[PDB]
Structure 1
Amino acid sequence: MKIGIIGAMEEEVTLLRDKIENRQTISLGGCEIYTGQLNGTEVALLKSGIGKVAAALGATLLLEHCKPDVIINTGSAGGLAPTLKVGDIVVSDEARYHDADVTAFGYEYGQLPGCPAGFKADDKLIAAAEACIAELNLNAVRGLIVSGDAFINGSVGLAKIRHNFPQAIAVEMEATAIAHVCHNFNVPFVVVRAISDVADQQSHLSFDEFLAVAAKQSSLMVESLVQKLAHG
């Protein structure tokens, strides 16, 4: 059982990278992949870079080059659900592009031709993630996570996302790309991110101040999820 883990920023993968034993590093297509075991479990950790294309490139290499069984996307996110606070966890049951638009031809907003309107996360990955959340007494929300190539900082950007996806519990920039690639390779995935800001007018400041806290919380959650998938 090999578990793939994808993080966008170094800060989001560094703590996990530090724990990987029998660690080997591969530099490819401008990305870095770290293989080895995390607390006894075989993993493949990828630092992709920010945005949809970087994450897609990275996920593609990870899949074709290491062949993981499942993909877990870790990292930070802007919280949209009213119950969310910095440090809290968001688990995807689904991912959709909030910035894709081909409605001129009758596709659903957010949907790209040749893809389903939304990519569903894997049920077992979701259940495991949630049992970890319960065992660690974490505050979390499960639901629609939307991705785009823009940092949401209130104003018009936030308004468009609320209009098109009022039920989105969070927004970020790599999730759906990873889901899309996993979809094309028939690989199950799940997003498990921690909130660094609430995508409003002060989100840049909040991101500066809470990225580290978000990276650590999601990172700990990924660690527990790996262990739970590996030994029930």
Structure 2
Amino acid sequence: EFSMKIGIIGAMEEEVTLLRDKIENRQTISLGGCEIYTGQLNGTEVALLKSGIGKVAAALGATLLLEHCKPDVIINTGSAGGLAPTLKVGDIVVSDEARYHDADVTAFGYEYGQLPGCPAGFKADDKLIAAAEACIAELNLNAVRGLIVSGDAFINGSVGLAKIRHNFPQAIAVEMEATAIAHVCHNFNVPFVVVRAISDVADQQSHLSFDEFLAVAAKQSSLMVESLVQKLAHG
């Protein structure tokens, strides 16, 4: 305790800003097109990286963060399109696993979503998940735990969504960085957990919904992250 460094990766300005503004003794390190904010969040040493959007940007960011700040665990936050029926805009999704919904080397006998040399899915850390569920209960928020899928496409209904629902009937949310981050953490053997807030249900109106509720998603994911850091650091 007291010597834990918690890594946090968010892709977009909005939520990252709220967390960034709350960092004490904040400093900014700009690298490979990424900004990394170091300091403490309510006492806990954190390293917050604003990655770009997409798998590669997230991978590049996650790799840089691991390499230069060597955080003990990684928390990926931000928005996501809710897929589980009980999810409403603002609700929380916690990954117990992450899979690429757009990876496909099945022609070679790999499981759909699986890339060669990688497990079909990347498992989030049990302690981190439990911690997150603890915060969820304590904050009295509605949330769902389960499989989160990533791809380099903003899902907006039509075939994008149906294909995902068909390939991963159990997926609770879809977004664009989670699995890339999980993938990099897996390779570095670093525990991770994805804690995002719903900004849309990835249907025909996901773009306007995203546009109108990105703010609330940022508010709720940031609140959860702040709460998770605290709980991970103490109790």
* Interval containing the TM-score (normalised by the shorter chain): over 0.9
Q: Does 1:59 align with 2:62?
A: yes
Q: Any idea what the Cα deviations from partners look like across 1:79-121, whole Å, max 9, x if unmatched?
A: 0000000000000000000000000000000000000000000
Q: In 2, distance between residues paired with 1:206 and 1:156?
A: 19
Misfit runs of 4+, over 4 Å:
none
Deviation at 1:49, TM superposition (A): 0.8
CA distance in 2, matches of 1:50, 1:218: 17
Following the alignment from structure 2 to structure 1, what is the Cα–Cα distance between the partners of residues 107 and 17? 43
Alpha-carbon separation, structure 2, partners of 1:62 and 1:212? 25
| Percent identical residues | 100
Flag structure 1 segments of 5+ consecutive residues without an equivalent. none
- Kindly state the Cα deviation for residue 27 of structure 1 after the two structures are TM-superposed: 0.5
1:201 match: 204
Gap regions ≥5 residues in structure 2:
none
Over the aligned positions, Cα root-mean-square deviation in angstroms equals 0.4
> For 1:166, what is the secondary structure of its paired residue?
coil
> Deviations 1:134-178 (Å, cap 9, x if unpaired)?
000000000000000000000010011011001100000000000
C-alpha distance in 1 between matches for 2:147 and 2:12: 22
Shift of residue 57 of structure 1? 0.2
Distance apart, 1:185 and its partner CA: 0.2
Q: Is 1:27 paired with 2:30?
A: yes
1:86-125 matched pairs, under 5 angstroms? 86-125=89-128
Shift of 1:194: 0.1
- Residue 45 (structure 1) shift: 0.2
Q: Distance in 2 between matches of 1:148 and 1:85?
A: 22
- Taking structure 2 as the reference length, the TM-score comes to 0.98
